[PDB]
Write a protein that binds this DNA or RNA. Sequence first.
RNA 1: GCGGGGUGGAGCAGCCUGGUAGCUCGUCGGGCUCAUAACCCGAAGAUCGUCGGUUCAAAUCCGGCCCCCGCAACCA
Lengths: 254, 17, 404
Amino acid sequence: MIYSRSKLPSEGEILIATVKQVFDYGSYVSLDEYGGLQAFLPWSEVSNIRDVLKENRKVIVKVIRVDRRKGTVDVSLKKVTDDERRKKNLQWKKIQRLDKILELVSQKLKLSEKDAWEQVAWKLEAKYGDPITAIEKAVKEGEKILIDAGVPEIWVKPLLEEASRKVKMSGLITVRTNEPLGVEKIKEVISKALENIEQDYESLLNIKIYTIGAPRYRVDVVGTNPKEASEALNQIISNLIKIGKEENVDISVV
Amino acid sequence: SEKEYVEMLDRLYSKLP
Amino acid sequence: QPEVNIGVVGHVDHGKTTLVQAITGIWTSKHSEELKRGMTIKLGYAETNIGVCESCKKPEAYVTEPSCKSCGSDDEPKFLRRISFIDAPGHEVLMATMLSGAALMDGAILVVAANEPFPQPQTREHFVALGIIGVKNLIIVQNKVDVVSKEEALSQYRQIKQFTKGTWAENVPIIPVSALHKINIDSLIEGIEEYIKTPYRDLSQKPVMLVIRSFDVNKPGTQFNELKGGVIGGSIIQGLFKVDQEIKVLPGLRVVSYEPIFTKISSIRFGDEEFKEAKPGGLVAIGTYLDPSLTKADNLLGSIITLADAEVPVLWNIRIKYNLLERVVGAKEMLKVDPIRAKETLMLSVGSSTTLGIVTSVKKDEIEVELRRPVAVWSNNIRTVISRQIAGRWRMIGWGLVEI
RNA sequence: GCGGGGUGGAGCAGCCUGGUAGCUCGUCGGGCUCAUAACCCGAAGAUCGUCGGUUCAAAUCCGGCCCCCGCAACCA
Ligand SMILES: Nc1nc2c(ncn2[C@@H]2O[C@H](COP(=O)(O)OP(=O)(O)NP(=O)(O)O)[C@@H](O)[C@H]2O)c(=O)[nH]1
Ligand code: MET
Ligand SMILES: [Mg+2]
């Protein structure tokens, strides 16, 4: 449900709708941004036709005709520039993060998605912005970004909390040694150079060190934020060297 | 000493397919 | 743990490894994929249990699993010993390893092929190597009789019974087999249960052992938390090792000099089963605590392990007393051995090791040799084997005794 | 243990960053040429290893399970 603060879409407008009913001489669609406002789309505006004239695939179109009178609307998918077709295609993934949010907060709060869209999304319209971003600043910054615009402080928290992932990086090292109890010292320098790292270059997901040659090894930092990669990794590889180099065990990046 | 052996040769041959 | 070390010498593709497979079951893998299209390339390894049917008739009475109900009847055959083999290769060029290998043997079995011209190059090369080093407990075996005329295998037995004459080989019996259909193997077990007796070894002696493999157990990917130690494969000859002893490897890693490596016996294993100690006859494997880099592919090949704080010479230059063959039994051609000229490069095979060296002194039977890689000379009794690059490929030409 | 690929019959793009499965051949039909699949035109034909999840929507993103090829190595 994406309730609209208008009755009819402005003519010539572009939006995401969904194919409802395939009939012979066109089909009925439903403008998802206008409370599923059913409208009419004729072949003279289409063009393998079975996968976009599908039962439920959510197409994008431009509003050919709005007859404010009877309250009917006609749209076309020809008349959609492909320069419009992308921009208003990202706007989609945004406007549906939102949908989900209110679609669960309202429910949670046991109210209405109409009162979730009236209240949350229409006043966060005021504060210049795609509301999902006035919440991306909110969840990061604070709930005072929510209260500023006067968003009825009932959703506020249920919003934020109903609002809030891997990358892999690796390296070939070389660890030689001749110590009488070498293996051991390997285990050591690795478990001293892989220390307190979970908090240094902080929260990542998992780190794995293994032998893929006999002196050549691989370290493996996997994480949530790409540019946290070698940050962690390099540090580790450094402290290899150092502690390796401070505990008679030679180590060296390939 | 062949007897022991000649024997052995016998006994294997009699085990063929 | 296995009592004794039996070697399976012989020419190429006569089936040495195959006979080992009919006796133990084990294959030598044939590995490195290369061996899988080629043939045995590292010394193969395998063990087995020999029990006997008391309660019935021999040779068949010679069993392999605690089970007599195979012949006569049930009474669980009595266990005599557990033995081990060393499958060499057969190829004219793997000579340098087979030599090496002999150093661990306590006896052997010469696999001749029943369907190819008796004294074939390597068959001889080996045989004389055997009579040279000292492996006097020999059993010749006529293999591929499952593909011959009942006349052919007897006439070969003749040429054999005639070669085995002037030579040291009195009644070295000859047991024809079929390594392919595992036929007659039990009389082979009876031969090897008679003639290849299990030598006594004073334990009290200095703990001393030869190395011929070594591996990085660690699987591609095991984490550092459980990187299992470096692992040294080889055979003991005198003394006995125990879990948790302090040990060294000679000559050890090099710099150009050569220093000993110390570590603690992390673990002891024979076959797949772990033991707390280890004694001669067999091959062992020793779990260590040293960086497996140090013994990946088979690095410390030709190295030896002894008691830490023990007295053994790491020579660069050595005094050999020596003798020659009159012929080069190992080329298809028997060309007569040229006497040693000084400043000549010769392969000196000492113990398991295989080293190269140059001749500084040429007397009647005492030459002095300068070596690339040091030899740790553990005894005064150090047997050695001497070779020359005759026609591109190296060839066994004579022997002697290390001297200190 | 990581990979690398998996897509009409074939050879493969497409997968990053999700919105009617593309090529080239082959087939088939017809065309054009004096005769040529030489060209012109058309059809057919891949629910894009497998099983599942996310998604309004997936060949594409996500993970278990397979099938070859590179890495490694007989792993006491
Ligand atoms: N018919 C027959 N074929 C045999 C017999 N023994 C071995 N073979 C065949 O000979 C081939 C050689 O086997 P293999 O054991 O590798 O020979 P090898 O002598 O061990 N090779 P290497 O000399 O390098 O150790 C095998 O393919 C096997 O099928 C036998 O008794 N009869
Ligand atoms: C390894 O299994 C060992 N203990 C036996 C000899 S090494 C092949
Ligand atoms: Mg073989």
